[PDB]
A paper describes a structure:
The key determinant of host specificity is the envelope-located trimeric spike (S) glycoprotein, which can be further cleaved by host proteases into an N-terminal S1 subunit and a membrane-bound C-terminal S2 region. In the S1 subunit, the receptor binding domain (RBD, also called the C terminal domain, CTD) is localized in the C-terminal region, spanning ∼200 amino acids, and structural studies have revealed that the RBD consists of two subdomains: the core and external subdomains. For both MERS-CoV and SARS-CoV S proteins, the S2 subunit is mainly composed of α-helices and forms the stem region of the S protein. Here we present high-resolution structures of the trimeric MERS-CoV and SARS-CoV S proteins in its pre-fusion conformation by single particle cryo-electron microscopy (cryo-EM).
For the MERS-CoV S protein, we also mutated the S2 cleavage site to enhance the stability. The cleaved form of the MERS-CoV S ectodomain was confirmed by SDS–polyacrylamide gel electrophoresis (SDS–PAGE), and further N-terminal sequencing revealed that the S ectodomain protein was cleaved after residue R748, three residues ahead of the S2 cleavage site. Strikingly, for both trimers we observed two different classes of particles during three-dimensional classification, representing two conformations of the trimeric S protein with RBDs in different states (standing or lying). For MERS-CoV S trimer, two classes were found with one or two of the three S1 RBDs in the S trimer in the ‘standing' state. The reconstructed maps of these two conformations were refined to 4.1 and 4.2 Å resolutions without symmetry imposed, respectively. The atomic model was used to interpret the 4.1 and 4.2 Å maps after being fitted into the map by domains. The MERS-CoV S1/S2 trimers could be classified into two classes with one (40% of particles) or two (60% of particles) RBDs in the standing state, and we cannot detect other conformations with all three RBDs in the standing or lying state. In the MERS-CoV or SARS-CoV S trimers, compared with the rest of the maps, the RBD region in the standing state features weaker and poorer density and has lower local resolution, which likely correlates with the flexibility for receptor binding in vivo. However, our unprecedented observation of an inherently flexible RBD in both the MERS-CoV and SARS-CoV S trimers provides a plausible explanation for the receptor binding process for the two CoVs, as the receptor binding surface can be fully exposed in the standing state. We hypothesis that on the cell surface one CD26 may crosslink two S trimers by binding to standing RBDs, one from each trimer, whereas the monomeric ACE2 receptor will bind to the SARS-CoV S trimer in the pattern of one receptor to one S trimer.
Author numbering:
A (entry chain B): 851 to 877, 886 to 899
B (entry chain C): 802 to 850
C (entry chain B): 949 to 1144
D (entry chain C): 1047 to 1095
E (entry chain A): 1096 to 1144
F (entry chain C): 900 to 915, 924 to 948
G (entry chain B): 18 to 377, 381 to 588, 595 to 698, 710 to 744
H (entry chain A): 508 to 588, 595 to 654
Amino acid sequence: ASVKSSQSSPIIPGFGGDFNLTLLEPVARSAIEDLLFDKVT
Amino acid sequence: VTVDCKQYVCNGFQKCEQLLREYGQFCSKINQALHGANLRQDDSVRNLF
Amino acid sequence: SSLLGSIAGVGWTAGLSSFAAIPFAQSIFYRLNGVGITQQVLSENQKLIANKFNQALGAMQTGFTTTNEAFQKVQDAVNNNAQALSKLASELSNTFGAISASIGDIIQRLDVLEQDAQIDRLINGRLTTLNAFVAQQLVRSESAALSAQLAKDKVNECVKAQSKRSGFCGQGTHIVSFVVNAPNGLYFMHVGYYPS
Amino acid sequence: ISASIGDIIQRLDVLEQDAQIDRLINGRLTTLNAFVAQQLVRSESAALS
Amino acid sequence: AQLAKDKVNECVKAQSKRSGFCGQGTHIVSFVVNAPNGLYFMHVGYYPS
Amino acid sequence: IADPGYMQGYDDCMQQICAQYVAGYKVLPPLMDVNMEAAYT
Amino acid sequence: YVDVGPDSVKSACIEVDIQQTFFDKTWPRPIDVSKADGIIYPQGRTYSNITITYQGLFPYQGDHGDMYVYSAGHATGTTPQKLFVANYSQDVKQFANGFVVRIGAAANSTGTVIISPSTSATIRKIYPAFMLGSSVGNFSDGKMGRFFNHTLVLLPDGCGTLLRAFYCILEPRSGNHCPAGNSYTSFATYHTPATDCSDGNYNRNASLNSFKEYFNLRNCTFMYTYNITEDEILEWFGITQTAQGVHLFSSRYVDLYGGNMFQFATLPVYDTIKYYSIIPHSIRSIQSDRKAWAAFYVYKLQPLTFLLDFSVDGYIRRAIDCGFNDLSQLHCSYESFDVESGVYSVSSFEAKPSGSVVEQVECDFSPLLSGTPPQVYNFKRLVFTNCNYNLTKLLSLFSVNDFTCSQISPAAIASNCYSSLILDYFSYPLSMKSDLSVSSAGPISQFNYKQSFSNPTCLILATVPHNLTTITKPLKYSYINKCSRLLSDDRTEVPQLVNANQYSPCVSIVPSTVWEDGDYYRKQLSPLEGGGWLVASGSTVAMTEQLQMGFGITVQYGTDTNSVCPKLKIASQLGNCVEYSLYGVSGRGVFQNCTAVGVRQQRFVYDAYQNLVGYYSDDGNYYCLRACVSVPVSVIYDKETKTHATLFGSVACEHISSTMSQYSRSTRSMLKPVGCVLGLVNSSLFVEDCKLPLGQSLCALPDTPST
Amino acid sequence: SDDRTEVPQLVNANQYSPCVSIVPSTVWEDGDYYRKQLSPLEGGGWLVASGSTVAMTEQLQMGFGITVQYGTDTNSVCPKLKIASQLGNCVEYSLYGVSGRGVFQNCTAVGVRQQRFVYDAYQNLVGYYSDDGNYYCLRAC
């Protein structure tokens, strides 16, 4: 509740041109988050 | 400071060393725990400077 | 993910939070204009920076294991609470007490009179060590709430705003920072400057 | 009975000797484990500070 | 308590141009009253809506 | 401080704290020589 | 008893040539537990792919063990002659915890024929034979190696196709060259391959028959046979003993190709095995049939904690001897064939006691032997300060019926030195032993005699013989069975309990001997004494043939202390290191002529704790003591290149020696010099600046990269 | 070997006394004593013993000492009296010297297979053996 409050862009596959952001959700637990959930045992 | 258990308890006497061998798990967890404590502290020194 | 949405517009600022929708590229040219105080002629001529930013995030993709703590801190956390839970609960049961086959003299050995004596050893001991586990959960719970209030201090400073301050926002004049949920915690991908 | 070895020779028979010594090891190692918990406490607070 | 001193010197004297700590919104005023064992804050924040 | 011993204080106490005599407990050195912490600051 | 077949009908034994120098070879095959050499699988349960630290009987890493070799005998071109053996029969070993045996390791390689060193041949596996038992000595002609009473014999046979295990009395036979005959050198076993190992017709009794020529087997409780499939594969054999009996282990049946040992027999041998020898075998080949036989190796077992690595299929293919050194310790003290790369502290290295200083003549037990021992409630007290005692002397006069101590043992109470001995003696009947106890609430502890609970105590029941005549008997044994006060209200009764080191308050009214069982005594009290009455009642036990006595000893154990040691240059100055043993206290110290703080008329000086820092006693100077010397060692493991490097804590480049022999624990069995910035390290080299910096980042500032 | 020091030879569990070599199978008379000089290899000095007697009774009186080991393995040893066998594919079992409550399944394939349990680094058994002859790996309740 002290995280969100306001106001998204929203999540579109192009965030920044051209900053390749891995932090996109592919679709729900984005790709870098997938790396640090798969590699953690 | 790290304690060198299995010779803190006991003073170095063989019967008492065998009675430690019964507790050979606990001593390992002691010195394991302190060595972990020193690596966390040492990374606080290193990361600090 | 809505936090990643608010990275660009909220990282502007001009107040937290009553804003905005600005593209992420221009958010890093203003975040980069701010504290890496290179003004507009350098970011105009040139960009690519973009390929250096993406190169930075690329090595941020490849490197997790093993020599890259933070990540060993993450598995120090999962191995911490998994170790405490399962391994301390494996020390708590099987075995502790003086005669400790789960049930002393379970259904198979003597004595019915002394059975309460050895069992009461096992209950005083096993419940006492359980109470040590409860004291431990209060300790790591309170320290987890301290560190969570730190994370709220790292989201409201380093993630929304820039934050014109040193590490906390680790090692260099800070530019962007990203939040992803790690096991039990958050996880930051602070994008800092490095002069060299 | 805690003259640094519980009835090592002297002060009690060897078979019991293990009884008084095992008192001294359970106690002395348990209090050592309290020292290790204390080092974890002041180590964590030292890393906070 | 050192946090409270950090909340009095930041949020109570000055404004403090920072998020929560100075809870939930662009902070405006904050007031201090003595509670049982502690202080107590009445942070007056903005709420856009 | 009654401590420390680094190849002069062990022998110096042997000429006579007991991190090196009970053993027992034992104090490890602090990762950095004093001239070098002095170099940082 | 079991029929083991007929005695030998031979009237002589085969002559035996002992030539130890032909068997003195260096063919090292040390234990390598990395390859799981010498590993008995755990008995209690069995496991899958799991690794673990486990304490059990193991040989130690790098142990070369004892090597044994069997040889072809003397021969002409046509005729086997004298046997040819080593001196193994006279070399009796202590069994201790048992042993494991590496068998056949050199099989298939080329080696010497032993009796003809210039002749080489393909090496074939041969099986060892053992003699084990509880009692040994010499044969009639004085040679060692004779086993007495029932003896366990493990004897392979049938050209290596069976093992025989049997437990018999071994009666030495008296023909020429036999162990109770003339011209005896050594016993041995043999077989004759030309006639015993022909295809399809192996002689399954050849070795047994040869053994029966040297010994008649008598009163055999069992004779078991175990069949062995013929091959040249390396194997391991083990033997231990547990109350059930003697347990035999082999790799053959469960892990033929890998070497792990599993139990295949428990022999009903319940007399503890203390000794064993290797039975020499000689092969009665003719010259053209001579082969080389694989040496075998015996390694003693001891309780050790190993890291055990279990494969998926359950077998152990890699172990670590944790106590081998600090690196292995780290390796282990973690339950992990791999210990992450860093500094790991392993314990001392404490110095050895040398120059055991003893400080203190002859304790006077006189008045005990002369007269009539009083009754328990009038016990006489002998005090002992500053003297030497022969107590086993005193207890050799009497016949002793019971000896129990509290917070000490009877063994210990003879040995140790004490400041303040006290001997209490009195007449006391053996019939009342259950009432003379430190854990007793009978009349004796209540009203007669109570020892201190704060000092270590002993209680002795004895009987004066006849041989002792200066000790006179009284009319009967007497004791107090009631001692109470009647308050001035005439009907509150308050028992008057005896306090330690004191007499009963009723000894003023109870005669030195009670006239008749059940007599009672009374005495009105003065208003100052409290008013009311004092009341007592005496009991009697009939006098015995030989007088029976009670002895109570109390040692300090203080407090005020010193000068009372037993009796029996080096035990004085200048023992300027560990150890001392003062009459007052034990301890291990380094005395120095220090100055000048103390009391100086009683002898010690403490520093706010139990310790003594430490002068007195010498005559008269200041030998101030210190705590023990310990070298606070560590390990610099570096698992990437697997290179350990033992670091000492803070001392010394000058004081250590390589594989230091003045100190106790490496730790523990085996160890394995550059400083001096931090301390001393057993690792080259000197700086070597400057890089990078990173882990594994040792102390003050050696940053120590590898390799 | 000093002719002064007497050291009692205490019997260890599930062994005989070191004095059974010199004490007759029945003591001839109460208080008889036995001696045997020791070889320098045996330690020197002497071995010494003394026997006691109690008068025989009308009916012979005996002593029995029993010692049990819970398996673990072999050879097995239960009292006597499709059921108490497979397929009890849930709780409960009661094996040789070991109790427990488990859900057996035909699993594969890790063990010793010669002695008949398998543990996993603790007191527990995970868990096959004993059935004849298959892999009924057990689980907790």
